[PDB]
Amino acid sequence: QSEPWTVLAHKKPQKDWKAYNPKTMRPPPLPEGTKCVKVMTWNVNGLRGLLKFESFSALQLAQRENFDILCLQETKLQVKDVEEIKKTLIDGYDHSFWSCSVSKLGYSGTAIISRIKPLSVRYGTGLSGHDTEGRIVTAEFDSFYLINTYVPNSGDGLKRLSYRIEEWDRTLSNHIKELEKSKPVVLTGDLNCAHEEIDIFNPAGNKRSAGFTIEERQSFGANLLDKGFVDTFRKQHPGVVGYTYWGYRHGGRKTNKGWRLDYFLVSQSIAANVHDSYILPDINGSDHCPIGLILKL
DNA sequence: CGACGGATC
DNA sequence: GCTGATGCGC
DNA sequence: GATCCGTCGGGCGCATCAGC
Ligand SMILES: *O[C@H]1CCO[C@@H]1COP(=O)(O)O
């Protein structure tokens, strides 16, 4: 009730399944002398909105969880609004990279804020440049790549399901795999798919809802996992029900009636270096909550 | 997106 | 130029 | 017993506009 995630919420669960509790299921902090990267990812549902929330201060988050790189989705920013925010950004993180939808305005929008100068930063899939909907940001680091994405929602009526499955999902795969040729890859963001029924509260009701269509779930396996990539949370907390998105319509958060739509998918070659893929259901301000990764470098 | 029939499988 | 209302995808 | 379909309906951030 003050921690409603700790309660298991599911329409057709299984007895083995236990609800994720970060305070008990998270490994202890890593040893002092460990080359680690700590990333965080959050679909803020409007960056401007979020900065104007209860008492939100990015600085607090970066103090609370001491993240090295922050990945944001659905900034809802225009390329005009970037310079202002880029200053107000978390102080101490001065290398920030932003991508905004230029078509539908105040929609979509990705961003990577880091205190580690990347070796390079490119937007969109390949040298095609910024995605029109500002949905892809890719950053090269010394040992790996980090792709932040806000996958296009197939929409109500699934009127974008064909674009999603036949175009987006494919190109995102091809982008990732081309990169893996050189350095390993870490994909994160709002992938907009609950892979399994453990990743959703009402699997049956949402069989034709965007996010849980068999088509989208197959593509997740086919275009991504079955092509060399690992769901960091799922490998670490098998049979644990943790959600990353709760709707506003019915206060799903107060009832943990949630989906898991945000991931940290990593290449197999690096899956052992994963220390903790986690979820922070406590941090409000968005219909999504933050998720984090601690990767031994 | 959850939740609710009634009709359908 | 400012606000409440509207519209639309999430 | 389940799935299906058709419906509602105290949601939200942002852009745009009417009407001051
Ligand atoms: O219906 C919800 C759950 C699956 O997709 C929408 C959420 O959209 P995102 O904010 O995840 O794009």
PDB file of N, CA, C and O (backbone and C1' of nucleotides) and ligand atoms in Angstrom, chain A residues 43 74 150-153 190 192 209-212 245 259 261-262 287-288, chain B residues 1, chain C residues 10, ligand 1:
ATOM      1  N   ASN A  43      11.014   6.248 -19.141  1.00  0.00           N
ATOM      2  CA  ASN A  43      10.063   6.881 -20.046  1.00  0.00           C
ATOM      3  C   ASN A  43       9.359   7.941 -19.219  1.00  0.00           C
ATOM      4  O   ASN A  43       8.501   7.617 -18.389  1.00  0.00           O
ATOM      5  N   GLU A  74      10.142   9.313 -24.544  1.00  0.00           N
ATOM      6  CA  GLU A  74       8.948  10.157 -24.558  1.00  0.00           C
ATOM      7  C   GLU A  74       9.232  11.486 -23.844  1.00  0.00           C
ATOM      8  O   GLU A  74       8.477  11.934 -22.972  1.00  0.00           O
ATOM      9  N   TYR A 150      12.683   4.399 -28.205  1.00  0.00           N
ATOM     10  CA  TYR A 150      11.288   4.428 -27.800  1.00  0.00           C
ATOM     11  C   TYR A 150      10.590   3.838 -29.007  1.00  0.00           C
ATOM     12  O   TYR A 150      10.303   4.539 -29.982  1.00  0.00           O
ATOM     13  N   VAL A 151      10.352   2.534 -28.934  1.00  0.00           N
ATOM     14  CA  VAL A 151       9.765   1.748 -30.006  1.00  0.00           C
ATOM     15  C   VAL A 151       8.374   2.275 -30.318  1.00  0.00           C
ATOM     16  O   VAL A 151       7.615   2.584 -29.389  1.00  0.00           O
ATOM     17  N   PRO A 152       7.992   2.377 -31.589  1.00  0.00           N
ATOM     18  CA  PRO A 152       6.655   2.890 -31.904  1.00  0.00           C
ATOM     19  C   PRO A 152       5.544   1.946 -31.484  1.00  0.00           C
ATOM     20  O   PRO A 152       5.581   0.734 -31.729  1.00  0.00           O
ATOM     21  N   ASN A 153       4.568   2.541 -30.809  1.00  0.00           N
ATOM     22  CA  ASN A 153       3.417   1.840 -30.280  1.00  0.00           C
ATOM     23  C   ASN A 153       2.514   1.493 -31.435  1.00  0.00           C
ATOM     24  O   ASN A 153       2.177   2.366 -32.245  1.00  0.00           O
ATOM     25  N   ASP A 190      11.935   1.928 -23.903  1.00  0.00           N
ATOM     26  CA  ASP A 190      10.564   1.433 -23.934  1.00  0.00           C
ATOM     27  C   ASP A 190      10.442   0.667 -25.236  1.00  0.00           C
ATOM     28  O   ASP A 190      10.233   1.246 -26.312  1.00  0.00           O
ATOM     29  N   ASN A 192       8.156  -1.551 -25.829  1.00  0.00           N
ATOM     30  CA  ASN A 192       6.740  -1.558 -26.193  1.00  0.00           C
ATOM     31  C   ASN A 192       6.241  -2.963 -26.503  1.00  0.00           C
ATOM     32  O   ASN A 192       5.439  -3.199 -27.412  1.00  0.00           O
ATOM     33  N   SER A 209      -4.362  -6.222 -27.746  1.00  0.00           N
ATOM     34  CA  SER A 209      -3.906  -4.903 -27.342  1.00  0.00           C
ATOM     35  C   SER A 209      -2.463  -4.715 -27.794  1.00  0.00           C
ATOM     36  O   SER A 209      -1.681  -5.671 -27.806  1.00  0.00           O
ATOM     37  N   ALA A 210      -2.108  -3.489 -28.183  1.00  0.00           N
ATOM     38  CA  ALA A 210      -0.752  -3.250 -28.658  1.00  0.00           C
ATOM     39  C   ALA A 210       0.224  -3.448 -27.513  1.00  0.00           C
ATOM     40  O   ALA A 210      -0.001  -2.969 -26.404  1.00  0.00           O
ATOM     41  N   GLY A 211       1.275  -4.220 -27.759  1.00  0.00           N
ATOM     42  CA  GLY A 211       2.217  -4.608 -26.725  1.00  0.00           C
ATOM     43  C   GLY A 211       2.217  -6.101 -26.433  1.00  0.00           C
ATOM     44  O   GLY A 211       3.271  -6.650 -26.090  1.00  0.00           O
ATOM     45  N   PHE A 212       1.055  -6.754 -26.540  1.00  0.00           N
ATOM     46  CA  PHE A 212       0.934  -8.170 -26.198  1.00  0.00           C
ATOM     47  C   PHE A 212       0.436  -9.010 -27.360  1.00  0.00           C
ATOM     48  O   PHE A 212       0.146 -10.198 -27.167  1.00  0.00           O
ATOM     49  N   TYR A 245       5.294  -0.410 -16.117  1.00  0.00           N
ATOM     50  CA  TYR A 245       4.322   0.583 -16.569  1.00  0.00           C
ATOM     51  C   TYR A 245       2.985   0.282 -15.920  1.00  0.00           C
ATOM     52  O   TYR A 245       2.528  -0.861 -15.942  1.00  0.00           O
ATOM     53  N   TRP A 259       2.178  -3.602 -16.635  1.00  0.00           N
ATOM     54  CA  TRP A 259       2.910  -4.240 -17.723  1.00  0.00           C
ATOM     55  C   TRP A 259       4.413  -4.101 -17.483  1.00  0.00           C
ATOM     56  O   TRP A 259       4.858  -3.279 -16.685  1.00  0.00           O
ATOM     57  N   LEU A 261       7.299  -3.085 -19.919  1.00  0.00           N
ATOM     58  CA  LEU A 261       7.529  -2.610 -21.272  1.00  0.00           C
ATOM     59  C   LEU A 261       8.923  -2.068 -21.489  1.00  0.00           C
ATOM     60  O   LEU A 261       9.285  -1.766 -22.629  1.00  0.00           O
ATOM     61  N   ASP A 262       9.720  -1.945 -20.442  1.00  0.00           N
ATOM     62  CA  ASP A 262      11.032  -1.321 -20.518  1.00  0.00           C
ATOM     63  C   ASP A 262      12.090  -2.337 -20.136  1.00  0.00           C
ATOM     64  O   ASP A 262      11.962  -3.009 -19.112  1.00  0.00           O
ATOM     65  N   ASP A 287       3.819   7.470 -16.036  1.00  0.00           N
ATOM     66  CA  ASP A 287       3.143   6.177 -15.990  1.00  0.00           C
ATOM     67  C   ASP A 287       4.144   5.022 -16.033  1.00  0.00           C
ATOM     68  O   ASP A 287       3.754   3.877 -15.785  1.00  0.00           O
ATOM     69  N   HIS A 288       5.410   5.282 -16.360  1.00  0.00           N
ATOM     70  CA  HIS A 288       6.472   4.290 -16.292  1.00  0.00           C
ATOM     71  C   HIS A 288       7.362   4.597 -15.099  1.00  0.00           C
ATOM     72  O   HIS A 288       7.482   5.746 -14.675  1.00  0.00           O
TER      73      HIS A 288
ATOM     74  P    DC B   1      -2.811   0.926 -23.097  1.00  0.00           P
ATOM     75  O5'  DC B   1      -3.316   0.165 -21.841  1.00  0.00           O
ATOM     76  C5'  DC B   1      -2.994   0.624 -20.614  1.00  0.00           C
ATOM     77  C4'  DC B   1      -3.955   0.028 -19.665  1.00  0.00           C
ATOM     78  C3'  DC B   1      -4.189  -1.455 -19.920  1.00  0.00           C
ATOM     79  O3'  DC B   1      -4.125  -2.105 -18.686  1.00  0.00           O
ATOM     80  C1'  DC B   1      -6.242  -0.236 -20.165  1.00  0.00           C
TER      81       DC B   1
ATOM     82  P    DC C  10       1.121   6.490 -30.454  1.00  0.00           P
ATOM     83  O5'  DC C  10       1.125   6.569 -28.862  1.00  0.00           O
ATOM     84  C5'  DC C  10       2.193   7.215 -28.197  1.00  0.00           C
ATOM     85  C4'  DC C  10       1.875   7.412 -26.738  1.00  0.00           C
ATOM     86  C3'  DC C  10       2.148   6.220 -25.824  1.00  0.00           C
ATOM     87  O3'  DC C  10       2.926   6.673 -24.697  1.00  0.00           O
ATOM     88  C1'  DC C  10       0.027   7.110 -25.428  1.00  0.00           C
TER      89       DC C  10
HETATM   90  O1  LIG E   1      -1.420   0.190 -23.478  1.00  0.00           O
HETATM   91  C1  LIG E   1      -0.148   0.661 -22.992  1.00  0.00           C
HETATM   92  C2  LIG E   1       0.632  -0.582 -22.619  1.00  0.00           C
HETATM   93  C3  LIG E   1       1.272  -0.993 -23.942  1.00  0.00           C
HETATM   94  O2  LIG E   1       1.377   0.195 -24.744  1.00  0.00           O
HETATM   95  C4  LIG E   1       0.696   1.274 -24.096  1.00  0.00           C
HETATM   96  C5  LIG E   1       1.751   2.172 -23.466  1.00  0.00           C
HETATM   97  O3  LIG E   1       2.472   2.953 -24.422  1.00  0.00           O
HETATM   98  P1  LIG E   1       3.999   3.321 -24.127  1.00  0.00           P
HETATM   99  O4  LIG E   1       3.991   4.494 -23.192  1.00  0.00           O
HETATM  100  O5  LIG E   1       4.536   2.073 -23.510  1.00  0.00           O
HETATM  101  O6  LIG E   1       4.487   3.643 -25.504  1.00  0.00           O
END
